Every structure is written in structure tokens, then in C-alpha cells.
Amino acid sequence: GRMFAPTQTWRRWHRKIPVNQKRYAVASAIAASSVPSLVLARGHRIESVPE
Amino acid sequence: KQPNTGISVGLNKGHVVTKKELAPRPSDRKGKTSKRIHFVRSLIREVAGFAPYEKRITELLKVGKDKRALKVAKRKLGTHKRAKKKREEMSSVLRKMRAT
Amino acid sequence: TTRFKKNRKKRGHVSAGHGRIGKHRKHPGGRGNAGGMHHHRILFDKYHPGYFGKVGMRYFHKLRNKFYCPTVNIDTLWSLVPQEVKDKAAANKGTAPLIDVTQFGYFKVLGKGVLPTGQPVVVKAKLISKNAEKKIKENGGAVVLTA
Amino acid sequence: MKHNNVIPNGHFKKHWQNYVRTWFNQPARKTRRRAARQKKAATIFPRPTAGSLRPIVHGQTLKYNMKVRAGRGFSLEELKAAGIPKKLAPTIGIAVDHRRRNRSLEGLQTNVQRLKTYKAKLVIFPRRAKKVKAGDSSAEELANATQVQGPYLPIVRDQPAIELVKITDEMKSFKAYGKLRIERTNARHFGARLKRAAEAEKEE
RNA sequence: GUGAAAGCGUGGCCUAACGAUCCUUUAGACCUUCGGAAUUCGAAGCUAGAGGUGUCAGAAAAGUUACCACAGGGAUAACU
RNA sequence: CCCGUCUUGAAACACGGACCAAGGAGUCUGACAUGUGUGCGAGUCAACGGGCGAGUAAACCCGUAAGGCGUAAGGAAGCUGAUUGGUGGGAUCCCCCUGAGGGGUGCACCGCCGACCGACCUUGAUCUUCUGAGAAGGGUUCGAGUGUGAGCAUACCUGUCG
RNA sequence: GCGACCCCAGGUCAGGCGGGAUUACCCGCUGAGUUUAAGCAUAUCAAUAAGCGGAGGAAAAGAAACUUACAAGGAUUCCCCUAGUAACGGCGAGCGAACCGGGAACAGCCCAGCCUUAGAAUCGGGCGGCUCCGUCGUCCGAAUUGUAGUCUGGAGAAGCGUCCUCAGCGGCGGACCGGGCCCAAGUCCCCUGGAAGGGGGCGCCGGAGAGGGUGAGAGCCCCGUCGUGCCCGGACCCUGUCGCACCACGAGGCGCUGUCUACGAGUCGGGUUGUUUGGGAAUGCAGCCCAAAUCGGGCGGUGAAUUCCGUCCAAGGCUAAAU
Ligand SMILES: [K+]
Ligand SMILES: [K+]
Ligand SMILES: [K+]
Ligand SMILES: [K+]
Ligand SMILES: [K+]
Ligand SMILES: [K+]
Ligand SMILES: [K+]
Ligand SMILES: [K+]
Ligand SMILES: [K+]
Ligand SMILES: [K+]
Ligand SMILES: [K+]
Ligand SMILES: [K+]
Ligand SMILES: [K+]
Ligand SMILES: [K+]
Ligand SMILES: [K+]
Ligand SMILES: [Mg+2]
Ligand SMILES: [Mg+2]
Ligand SMILES: [Mg+2]
Ligand SMILES: [Mg+2]
Ligand SMILES: [Mg+2]
Ligand SMILES: [Mg+2]
Ligand SMILES: [Mg+2]
Ligand SMILES: [Mg+2]
Ligand SMILES: [Mg+2]
Ligand SMILES: [Mg+2]
Ligand SMILES: [Mg+2]
Ligand SMILES: [Mg+2]
Ligand SMILES: [Mg+2]
Ligand SMILES: [Mg+2]
Ligand SMILES: [Mg+2]
Ligand SMILES: [Mg+2]
Ligand SMILES: [Mg+2]
Ligand SMILES: [Mg+2]
Ligand SMILES: [Mg+2]
Ligand SMILES: [Mg+2]
Ligand SMILES: [Mg+2]
Ligand SMILES: [Mg+2]
Ligand SMILES: [Mg+2]
Ligand SMILES: [Mg+2]
Ligand SMILES: [Mg+2]
Ligand SMILES: [Mg+2]
Ligand SMILES: [Mg+2]
Ligand SMILES: [Mg+2]
Ligand SMILES: [Mg+2]
Ligand SMILES: [Mg+2]
Ligand SMILES: [Mg+2]
Ligand SMILES: [Mg+2]
Ligand SMILES: [Mg+2]
Ligand SMILES: [Mg+2]
Ligand SMILES: [Mg+2]
Ligand SMILES: [Mg+2]
Ligand SMILES: [Mg+2]
Ligand SMILES: [Mg+2]
Ligand SMILES: [Mg+2]
Ligand SMILES: [Mg+2]
Ligand SMILES: [Mg+2]
Ligand SMILES: [Mg+2]
Ligand SMILES: [Mg+2]
Ligand SMILES: [Mg+2]
Ligand SMILES: [Mg+2]
Ligand SMILES: [Mg+2]
Ligand SMILES: [Mg+2]
Ligand SMILES: [Mg+2]
Ligand SMILES: [Mg+2]
């Protein structure tokens, strides 16, 4: 038979987050990369990194 | 059609600008034909004559029923503008016919 | 987000939150705006007064550009001047800045609020209210008309 | 229908699902149009990629008459004033619009200067290699004969700076609101006043 | 209006005797609009009434089926 | 006493159900609304498109008088368009005093009453191009108004509607 | 009776054209009801499904009888916006465009009519030759009830002089599209196992750690993958360069000139009927009736007369791109 509520291509796939929020997210990520505790917490092996 | 006063309201309103006459165009003489075309149409009128309703209009103009002649013209042609132009044409034909 | 939809919390509860007695039938009150005068009369009168009927004159082929008339108030006029020009205004009291509101996308000047104290301004606009002109004049300014 | 809500007016009673236009090809359309422009630029090299020169025209209606934009093509009157025959203009990157009228001197003069500026920085290669004819350049075909990308005579706004004037007693006494009310009144009574004046002539 | 006057009178001594939208029609305002600009007709608006919905919060509406059909109802007849 | 179900009432002499496996029902989308999270804020939004770019359907950049919503309302319309708060309670803080105390401070919110803009009505010194201007002075009228903005984008639940 | 022309007939006459198929998109016609309105008839579903036709890689549309009322825009198409707006609607349910503005693309043109009359200057067919998508010669036809040139309103004809512009093919290369071929590094040692492609050890390639195959998780066993190099072909378009040729008689451009200055009819328009549209004293379309004009005609979203103003030039035709 026919499935319930058949999936349609015009589902709203995409999202447009405001540009200023996207820039906010990038800046936070860049700042987090300079914190060794956060970099280690994400699973990176930076035990021999000079700085 | 005076130059604009420079105010946004009132008569002759609008932004101040130096107006100039539009350059002449060939289409300005639309509705005018050559002398030959007038000659051809005049000759064909003699050969063809007048239509039955045109004969009715001129008969009314002979008895002086100008108002009724115009109403017949409007019923036939359709518009008042064309009806009164047609009546004047019939009057011109009759005017120079009684003088001959 | 399907996992937050409350129907998921209602799995295993038979009626899916729509009751055993009343049930969830197709259109038990008609579709859309049906019965606006008959069985939804109270709803329309209580929440939508004026809904039914006709008022005013028709306007065939009404173009909105003819009616374009953005307005700016007196209190907002000073904010249009650039900051560097504001300093010049306070540096020489003999002259006054010329604020052409049309250059900032405004046609008419309304008269809400007050102008900066001790600062004459020459306002250039298509239209102006009488209160706006009075406030400009009493501050030492003047009004010029344009189009 | 229930509660206090805006009256719904969804236009979804036809077979709308058969007329849905998706935009999943939007990135592909951008790619295809960019490729077409890139291909066109090489075809017309060294002619500018911006295309033909367009005139400056005013926006239409009261809402947009304060701005200027690119029009279709230069009017015949503008071309004649600039001394460029209309049949030659399209062959040297000048758009021609035989329909546009010129109601004012300012509009005519603005585009005439635009044409002269364009001709100042226009390099025309000869039709045949060696022999050089009128209108062609000489020694400039190699110096600065490059394909210009983007606009070369942009149509932009030049907002005037705030000017500080001296307030004269004449301007202080001017009654702007009174002027507007008087002008409005004279406009809507123009017909009635002209009527009685004509009727007075009949009596007199 | 009435009474000398206080005062009384916004229908009937009090408790019933009546009617939306749209449309039509009338009254009123040296009123507004017909959007290229005018004049006069015509039309369209604004305010207050009238023409009615008695199933009276107001669809425009005759039967028959023993040839019958469907969704239901023990919310409801024909047994115990 | 047999579960499920409609029901005032089911173990019912009310209906479904012999048994097992697997499949099997509030979803997607448009509009709007309240609430909450986030960004910015009298602004906000990269949305058509362009410039590009992980050799790339992503990400990144672009709003020059673009546009949407907001920033001003009232009126059928012609049109006109906010003179910029008083008071009773009240959070917090400050001082005195150590009382269910007395002063200063008075945000948010609520009650009460003015003023301002507009429809309608009313009013008119003094002027004017005769129909407009407006010194003063208004109203048991009316408004989804003003009296130092709060919006815009976005995410999701719930609700109405197609 | 013999001839010319006209109309028609026959032909297995010589040489051509047409039918049918396909459905995603496209063009024309025809055309419902379920449904919604909590009933129902206008309405809505829908100018949709079904039905009947016709095309192409796109189709259709297209160079204003336009928008607008502004300081004006300027063929068509398409996107955003306009806007769920003006409007329409048992003004109920519902329905609903357009202009401006911002963008994608961009391209303009051809006829009919007065104008060879010292020459039908035009075209087809048969036959023949050549450098063969054509061209030349010759013959027979078409055509004066008009072929070719000139002209298309933006103009133009004619006259005058400024003395500006205009005449081909070929060789090579690039660009473009398609294909073919070669080309990196372990299968080293131990253990488990039917099998190592697994674990441990020791190495290597990497502009190639996409993917697949091979007896289990394989960059290095195999095909490929990355990046060059080499080779072959198709389009004849665009473009660079070289060689040869290069007659301005004529035509065009520019300037001036008294004069001339031809533009689509049972069509426009009007009445009426039906249908359709947001189009409302009537948006388009169609039937029937009436039936134009040439200093004129159409439009300017309320019917009508009068005075102006703005605007365009229908009743013939072609046309790439954005979709
Ligand atoms: K519920
Ligand atoms: K698509
Ligand atoms: K009833
Ligand atoms: K049950
Ligand atoms: K039962
Ligand atoms: K049972
Ligand atoms: K609600
Ligand atoms: K904005
Ligand atoms: K931009
Ligand atoms: K009113
Ligand atoms: K031949
Ligand atoms: K493998
Ligand atoms: K002609
Ligand atoms: K019609
Ligand atoms: K005209
Ligand atoms: Mg429960
Ligand atoms: Mg249930
Ligand atoms: Mg219910
Ligand atoms: Mg529902
Ligand atoms: Mg349906
Ligand atoms: Mg444009
Ligand atoms: Mg008395
Ligand atoms: Mg009574
Ligand atoms: Mg009544
Ligand atoms: Mg009425
Ligand atoms: Mg009009
Ligand atoms: Mg009742
Ligand atoms: Mg029956
Ligand atoms: Mg019972
Ligand atoms: Mg029971
Ligand atoms: Mg039970
Ligand atoms: Mg029992
Ligand atoms: Mg049952
Ligand atoms: Mg059973
Ligand atoms: Mg299962
Ligand atoms: Mg929110
Ligand atoms: Mg804007
Ligand atoms: Mg008023
Ligand atoms: Mg007031
Ligand atoms: Mg044969
Ligand atoms: Mg129904
Ligand atoms: Mg029903
Ligand atoms: Mg029914
Ligand atoms: Mg079909
Ligand atoms: Mg076919
Ligand atoms: Mg084909
Ligand atoms: Mg294409
Ligand atoms: Mg075509
Ligand atoms: Mg034309
Ligand atoms: Mg156009
Ligand atoms: Mg809106
Ligand atoms: Mg429809
Ligand atoms: Mg546009
Ligand atoms: Mg000829
Ligand atoms: Mg010539
Ligand atoms: Mg000539
Ligand atoms: Mg290999
Ligand atoms: Mg190893
Ligand atoms: Mg195995
Ligand atoms: Mg390669
Ligand atoms: Mg024509
Ligand atoms: Mg007709
Ligand atoms: Mg039909
Ligand atoms: Mg065509």
C-alpha cells in the first residue's frame, strides 16, 4: 500500500541563521581553539605542542 | 503648460526643470496622406457613390431634420464622435451640390 | 523535531489526547470560515467586530506610488545630521545647518518632540505640519519648500 | 474554528501540490549563468564584459523620481547632439533606444556628456589589419587594449554634503504651512473660478 | 408645551405589542470621490430612517417508494 | 469473573477478538498566534541576484536612494497629523531612629484624572488670492492614537485554519 | 472550320511535399463533477481532470495603436517585490492581477502601397560545363491581374556638397567538444586462521588515504585514483596570426534644401447575446446586426456631452539569449 504521510521533496530542508549569529559562532570557536583545556577536551593529542 | 513652480502641491507643481519641445518625429503627420491618396479616394467616391444609410442622412438634412440625422448616424456608426463627423461630411456634400 | 512532539508522549494512551467521548472527527464544525453568521456567530462578534459588511468608496486600479509620503518627526530630525556636522553646528552660531529631509527619503516633516536647545536649523521638505513649522521657527530656524 | 485568531485565508483549495516550484537547482543555476558569462567574455574579447553603454534615466512616478538608474539606450536626439550616427552607435558598444523622448534639457545634457566621456576612453581597432580608417586608433591597440571587467562608467548617487547657510529675516517670515494650504486651495478651486470668469464674459 | 408658579412632559399608569449583513429607497450636510486637467448629467460614499426575514441572532424550496440504497442508532418503535 | 470498546451503567444473554510472526495510525507544508531560547536593536533581515569557494548543491563576502516588517495615527474620502504628565499605591537604595516609626528616592505594574493628534461637533479676535489662514476657547462623542520608541531575524512545543 | 484566351477534366506523365509514433516540458480547442459553502441553485472545485488536435530542443511571446501623470520610463520572457494588495464575491464561502522598484538576459528587423518603362533588371525547370549545400551557359516556362530592386514612420523620396565609410579567398595556430595509450609505493619477518586482506615488527608512496576487486578491516597484490606527457578524431562556428588580392562606377554616413512625404476594411468601432476576467454602466474572446475615419485613429480602470492635454499608430510578417 501507500505509506502514511508520504515524504515530499518540498520539506523545509534548509535553514537561514542570521549572519550575525553565524559570525558569533565562528568567533567563539576560534577563541576556544586557543584554550589547551578545551582542545584536549575535544580529543586532540596536543601533549607535545610547544604552544 | 507653464514651467513647474518647484512646490509639491498647487497648480504647475513639480521639480524645477528646463522644459524643451520634443524633437519632431515622422509619426507627427500620422493621419495625413499624400495628395495622390486624396485624389484616389475622391475618384472612387464618384465611381462607387454613397451607401444606403448615407443617402438617408442627406435626405434628413434636406428637410432640415439635423437632430434626427445625427441620431440615425449614431445608431449606424455607433459613436457620437463618428456620427457628427459623418453628418458634417454629408452636409458638405449637399452644401456644394445645391450650389451647382 | 519529531522527538519533542507530544504525540510521542501519548503513545499507548488510545485516544491520542482527543478524548473517548468527543473523539477527533474530520470537520465537525465545517471547514475554514464556515458558519460565520450561524454557529460561529459569537466567535466572530466577540473577536472580529466589523468583519461582515461594506464600508467606504471603491478605488479602481489604485496605485500606491501616488500616495507615497514618508514622514519624519522633529525629534528625529537632528539624528539625520552626521556627527561631524553636529560639532560644526555648535562651533558657529551665526550659520545654521540645512537639513534636506528628501535626501534621506522623507517627504513631510511632522512635529512630535522638540529640537536641540539653542540650535537653529533650516529644514527643507516637500510638506510640513503647522506645529512642526512653529517649533522650527521658535528655535531660530526656517522652512524651505521643495519638490 | 476556535479561539481568538486572525481569520485564515490559505489559498490551498486547488491542486496546488502539482504546481510547487522547488529551488534545489538554485546553486546549479548560479553555476550555469557564471559559465555563460565566462564563455561570453572570451567571445567578445577585448570588448568590456559589462556590455553596451547604457544611459542615465530617472525613476518613474513620484516615489522614485529622485533617483537615477540605467536605461535601455541613448535617444536619437542624444546621439545627434554627441555627433554619433545612430547606425554606428550599436557597433561600438552604445545602446540605442529610438523610442525614448527628451522632455528636458538637463536629461539631454547628462547623457550627452556620458557619451563624450565614453568616446574619450574608447579604442577602436581597424576593420582590416594594415590600412587605418577614420575613427580608428593608432598605437593604442597594444598599449592599454585590455578587457575591462565590471562597470566602467558606474551610475551612482552623489549625495551633497550638509551646507550651513545664514538665516535671513526673509526666510524666518516665510509661512511654509500657509503657502501649502493656499496652494492646495487654489488647485481644487481652479475649475470653479475659471467657470464663473467664463460665465461673466457671456453676461458681459 | 402647559401652569400664577414650584413643577411636570423624550409617547400610552407599570409589567408584552417586535427585526442584522447585502441590496433598494428616502431625508440631511453652498459635504467627499469618479485617480491626465475641467464643466454639467449620471454614478459612487458619509449620517439617520423606511421596504424583512413570525423556523422571529434573520437559507430561496412539493411529493412518493411495497423496486429501493448507504452511514449509524438499542440515545428510539414493532416481541420476551 | 475476559480483555479492548461505546456507555448513567459490562463478567454480561452488548460488539471486536481461534493462534503466531512481520507490517500498521496527529505527519509534512503555508498563514497566524502565545510562550520560550538565541542574535542584534530604532532598527532588523544576504531572502532575487552577484562575487566566490571545500577543484566546490556547503562555507565565506556584498543592500550602493532595493525590498519586507518596524519607526504615526485618525478619516469613507478630500485631508490633517501627536506642547512633550499630575496623582494614590508600590520594588530598591540613602539618612535619622531602633516602634506595625519618621524623612528623602518612586523603577515595573495597577487605579484615577488632565493634556496632545485625528473623525465628528463647536469656536473666530486678526488676516486673505472668497476660501483658506488661526489670537483665544472648547466637547457625558468617537479612535486597533500621543505624552522619550521595541522591534526584526531565527529555533522549537502547543493551538486555529487550508 | 482554323486560332487565342478562360474555366475545367484525364494521366502508373517528369520531379517533389503530406499522413503515423512518442509525453516530461510547450501551443490551440473542448470541458465536467466529486468537493467547499457545515443544506443549496450563483459561486467554489476549475478557465482544472477526462476528451480532440499541433510542435520543438526548447515552445510560446516579442520590437508598443505600451507603462504612466513622474525630474518621466521604453520589444518579449523570467526571478524577487508589489501582495493575499486594488478589485471581484448569495460582498457569504472564498477569490485575486497589474505598474513602479531590484535583478537574469539582451537584438533587432522584413514587407504591402506613388516612384525600371531607354527595355522583368526577377524566378523555376530541362540539358551541358565547372572550383558542385553552389555557380555559369543555353533552351523551354512562370510572371505585367506584377517578379526583382528602392521605401517601412526610428523614417523616407528628390536636389545640393562634405569628401567620411563600404568590395574576397586561402595557409597555419589557438579556443571548443569527443576518444585512446603509458606512468607512485611491501605482497619483507613472527603469530592466529581453511584463506591474512587480522594482530605485532620493520619499511615505503602520497598533487594518488575516491571507489571497487582479490579466500576476513588491503594507500603500497590487481583495476583504478592524483598529476603530466603523447596520440586520434569531430565541429567550419568564434578567435589570433600570415600570404595574396584590394576597380568607390555605385550605395551608405554627415550637412543643408523650397518642395514632396502614399503607412494594412466587413477591419476598427458600436449594439446585442454567450462565455471568460480582479476588471467593477461591462477584461478579453466569439456569434449575429450595424459599420468607419485620414490635420485622422486607439488608449488614459465610473456611463454621458463639451473644452483641452498626454500617449502610442491596430486590423501583414520574422527574430537568438535569460525561462
Ligand atoms: K488534546
Ligand atoms: K526547480
Ligand atoms: K431559526
Ligand atoms: K464500542
Ligand atoms: K451498545
Ligand atoms: K464479545
Ligand atoms: K490564539
Ligand atoms: K529597511
Ligand atoms: K547588494
Ligand atoms: K468620516
Ligand atoms: K538553367
Ligand atoms: K580493497
Ligand atoms: K508606407
Ligand atoms: K463580457
Ligand atoms: K489622440
Ligand atoms: Mg489518561
Ligand atoms: Mg476512540
Ligand atoms: Mg469536538
Ligand atoms: Mg482539522
Ligand atoms: Mg481539492
Ligand atoms: Mg533595470
Ligand atoms: Mg408661559
Ligand atoms: Mg412605552
Ligand atoms: Mg429595518
Ligand atoms: Mg446605498
Ligand atoms: Mg480617469
Ligand atoms: Mg433563532
Ligand atoms: Mg426524491
Ligand atoms: Mg434503551
Ligand atoms: Mg443503553
Ligand atoms: Mg468491559
Ligand atoms: Mg444478561
Ligand atoms: Mg456497534
Ligand atoms: Mg467474533
Ligand atoms: Mg511490529
Ligand atoms: Mg518569539
Ligand atoms: Mg527603501
Ligand atoms: Mg479634516
Ligand atoms: Mg482636537
Ligand atoms: Mg510520375
Ligand atoms: Mg455542501
Ligand atoms: Mg458536510
Ligand atoms: Mg448534498
Ligand atoms: Mg487533459
Ligand atoms: Mg503530429
Ligand atoms: Mg524532434
Ligand atoms: Mg534556452
Ligand atoms: Mg518561436
Ligand atoms: Mg514600429
Ligand atoms: Mg518592457
Ligand atoms: Mg505586506
Ligand atoms: Mg478562479
Ligand atoms: Mg521591471
Ligand atoms: Mg515593386
Ligand atoms: Mg537612399
Ligand atoms: Mg533621403
Ligand atoms: Mg598500481
Ligand atoms: Mg603492519
Ligand atoms: Mg568469513
Ligand atoms: Mg588525470
Ligand atoms: Mg500598420
Ligand atoms: Mg463587438
Ligand atoms: Mg468555454
Ligand atoms: Mg512568432
One DSSP character per residue, B66-79 reads: HHHHHHHHHHHH-S
Q: Rounded to an integer, what distance in angstroms lies between the CA atom of residue D115 and that of residue D54? A: 9
> What is the identity of the amino acid at B40?
V
Angle, in degrees to the nearest 10, between helices D176-188 and C130-138: 150
Searching chain B, which residue's CA lies closest to the CA of residue C107?
A: B8
Is residue B60 packed enough to be buried (19+ CB in 10 Å), middle (13-18) or exposed (0-12)? buried
Q: Cβ–Cβ of D187/B15 closer than 8 Å?
A: no
Please tell me whether any atom of strand G lies within 7 Å of the Cβ of B67.
Answer: no
Q: Cβ–Cβ of D167/C140 closer than 8 Å?
A: yes
Nearest CB to C127; choose among B5, B8, B14: B8
Instruction: Provide residues 108-127 of C with CB closer than 7 Å to any strand F atom.
Output: 108, 110-114, 127
Instruction: Provide residues 18-57 of B with CB closer than 7 Å to any strand G atom.
Output: 19, 22, 25-27, 29-38, 40-41, 51-54
Three cell numbers at B75? 445608431
Q: If you write DSSP's letter for every residue of D132-190 in order, what string do you get?
A: --TT--SSHHHHS--PPPS-SS-----PPPP-EE---HHHHH--HHHHHHHHHHHHHTH
User: Ligand 55 center to residue D87 CA distance, Å?
Assistant: 14
Q: CA of B87 to nearest chain C CA: how many angstroms apart?
A: 36
Q: Rounded to an integer, what distance in angstroms lies between the CA atom of residue D121 and that of residue D137? A: 11
Q: Rounded to an integer, what distance in angstroms lies between the CA atom of residue D61 and that of residue C67? A: 10
Q: Residues by CB within 7 A of strand E: list them.
A: C 37-38, 41, 52-61, 63, 66; D 187-188, 190-192, 194-195
Is residue D145 packed enough to be buried (19+ CB in 10 Å), middle (13-18) or exposed (0-12)? exposed
Indicate the SS3 state at residue B99: coil
Residues of chain B positioned with their CB less than 8 A from the CB of C126: 8
| Residue C84, CA atoms < 13 Å, CB-side half-sphere | 3
Long-range contacts of D120-126 (CB under 8 A, 24+ apart): D121/D152, D122/D92, D122/D93, D124/D92
Count other C-beta atoms under 10 Å from residue C101's C-beta. Answer: 23
| Residue C138, CA atoms < 13 Å, CB-side half-sphere | 11
Q: State, as a whole number of angstroms, the distance between the CA of C89 and the C1' of E74.
A: 94
Please tell me whether any atom of strand G lies within 7 Å of the Cβ of D155.
Answer: no
Three cell numbers at D112? 550627452
Q: If you write DSSP's letter for every residue of chain C in order, what string do you get?
A: -GGG-HHHHTTTSSSTTSTTTT---S-TT-STTTTTTTTSHHHHHHH-TT-SS--S---TT--GGGG---EE-HHHHHHHS-HHHHHHHHH-SSSEEEEEGGGGT--EE---S-PPTT---EEEESEE-HHHHHHHHHTT-EEEE--
Cα angle B93, B98, B99; round to 5: 100
Ramachandran quadrant class, B72 (left: phi over 0; alpha: psi -120 to 50; beta: rest) = alpha
Q: How far is CA C20 from CA C16, C26, D2, D36, in A?
A: 10, 15, 20, 64
Q: Rounded to an integer, what distance in angstroms lies between the CA atom of residue B20 and that of residue B29? A: 20
Q: Rounded to an integer, what distance in angstroms lies between the CA atom of residue C105 and that of residue C72? A: 9
Nucleotide nearest to B17 (CA to C1'): G71
The closest of D81, D72, D88 to D116, measured between CA atoms, is D81
Write out the H or E segment, with its range, that includes residue A51: none
Indicate the SS3 state at residue A43: coil
Q: Rounded to an integer, what distance in angstroms lies between the CA atom of residue D99 and that of residue D76? A: 8
Nucleotide nearest to C42 (CA to C1'): E57
Count other C-beta atoms under 10 Å from residue D103's C-beta. Answer: 13
Q: Rounded to an integer, what distance in angstroms lies between the CA atom of residue B41 and that of residue B47? A: 10
Does residue A46 contact residue A40 with C-beta atoms inside 8 Å?
yes
Q: Rounded to an integer, what distance in angstroms lies between the CA atom of residue B22 and that of residue B43? A: 38
User: Ligand 27 center to residue C38 CA distance, Å?
Assistant: 10
Q: What residues contact C39, with CB distance under 8 A and at least 6 apart?
A: C29, C30
The b-or-e profile of D38-71 (16+ CB within 10 A means b, else e) is eeeeeeeeeebbeebbbbbbbeeebbeeeebeeb
Backbone angles phi, psi at C98, to 5 degrees: -105, 110
Does residue C96 contact residue C121 with C-beta atoms inside 8 Å?
yes
How many residues does the structure list for chain A? 51
Q: Cβ–Cβ of C127/B6 closer than 8 Å?
A: no
Exp. method = cryo-EM
Q: Cβ–Cβ of C145/B8 closer than 8 Å?
A: yes
The closest of D168, D106, B4, D37 to C122, measured between CA atoms, is D168
Instruction: Provide residues 30-49 of D with CB closer than 7 Å to any strand G atom.
Output: 32-33, 36-37, 40, 42-43, 45
> What is the identity of the amino acid at C109?
V
Sign of the four-CA dihedral A10, A11, A14, A15: positive
Q: State, as a whole number of angstroms, the distance between the CA of D72 and the C1' of G106.
A: 10
Q: State, as a whole number of angstroms, the distance between the CA of D9 and the C1' of E59.
A: 24
Q: Cβ–Cβ of D166/C47 closer than 8 Å?
A: no
The closest of C107, C129, C73, B19 to D64, measured between CA atoms, is C107
Q: Rounded to an integer, what distance in angstroms lies between the CA atom of residue C52 and that of residue C44? A: 9
Is residue D17 packed enough to be buried (19+ CB in 10 Å), middle (13-18) or exposed (0-12)? exposed
Q: State, as a whole number of angstroms, the distance between the CA of B40 and the C1' of G159.
A: 28
- Asked if the peptide bond before residue D46 counts as cis, ω within 30 degrees of 0, the response is yes
B vs D: CB pairs below 8 A:
39
The closest of B17, D146, B9 to C127, measured between CA atoms, is B9
The DSSP bridge pattern shows strands C71-72 and C108-109 to be parallel
Q: How far is CA D45 from CA A32, D36, D51, D88, D147, in A?
A: 49, 14, 11, 20, 6
Is residue D78 packed enough to be buried (19+ CB in 10 Å), middle (13-18) or exposed (0-12)? buried
Count other C-beta atoms under 10 Å from residue A4's C-beta. Answer: 5
Q: Rounded to an integer, what distance in angstroms lies between the CA atom of residue D162 and that of residue C91? A: 15
Three cell numbers at D62? 513620484
Does residue D115 contact residue D78 with C-beta atoms inside 8 Å?
yes
Question: Cα torsion for A37, A41, A43, A44, to the nearest 10°?
Answer: -10
Please tell me whether any atom of strand F lies within 7 Å of the Cβ of D98.
Answer: no
Q: Rounded to an integer, what distance in angstroms lies between the CA atom of residue D158 and that of residue C146? A: 19
Count other C-beta atoms under 10 Å from residue C142's C-beta. Answer: 24
Three cell numbers at D96? 540605442
Q: Cβ–Cβ of B14/C147 closer than 8 Å?
A: yes
Give how far the C-alpha of residue A14 lies from the chain's centroid of Cα atoms, to the nearest Å: 15
Residues of chain D positioned with their CB less than 8 A from the CB of C33: 1, 7-8
Does residue C73 contact residue D140 with C-beta atoms inside 8 Å?
no
A4 reaches D (C-beta below 8 A): no
C127 reaches B (C-beta below 8 A): yes
Nucleotide nearest to D188 (CA to C1'): F78
Is residue C130 packed enough to be buried (19+ CB in 10 Å), middle (13-18) or exposed (0-12)? middle
| Residue D30, CA atoms < 13 Å, CB-side half-sphere | 4
Nearest CB to B10; choose among D76, D101, D183: D183
Q: Cβ–Cβ of C128/D179 closer than 8 Å?
A: no
> What is the identity of the amino acid at C18?
H
The closest of C58, C77, C71, C137 to C110, measured between CA atoms, is C71
Q: What residues contact B27, with CB distance under 8 A and at least 6 apart?
A: none
Q: Rounded to an integer, what distance in angstroms lies between the CA atom of residue D89 and that of residue C72? A: 46
Place of cell 464674459: D201
Backbone angles phi, psi at D24, to 5 degrees: -65, -20
Chains D and C are in contact, defined as 3 or more C-beta pairs closer than 8 angstroms: yes
Three cell numbers at D199? 460665465
Indicate the SS3 state at residue B19: strand
The closest of C107, C40, C114, C145 to D180, measured between CA atoms, is C145
Three cell numbers at C90? 555648535
Q: Rounded to an integer, what distance in angstroms lies between the CA atom of residue C22 and that of residue C6? A: 20
Q: What residues contact C70, with CB distance under 8 A and at least 6 apart?
A: C105, C106, C107, C108
Q: If you write DSSP's letter for every residue of D42-99 in order, what string do you get?
A: HHTTTS-TT-SB--EEEPSHHHHTT-EEE-S-B-HHHHHHTT--TTTGGGGTB-B-SS
Q: Rounded to an integer, what distance in angstroms lies between the CA atom of residue C16 and that of residue C21? A: 13
Place of cell 558569533: A24
Q: How far is CA D189 from CA B10, B11, D183, D199, in A?
A: 10, 10, 10, 16
Does residue C80 contact residue C101 with C-beta atoms inside 8 Å?
yes
Three cell numbers at D118? 565614453
> What is the identity of the amino acid at D65?
N
Place of cell 473523539: C23
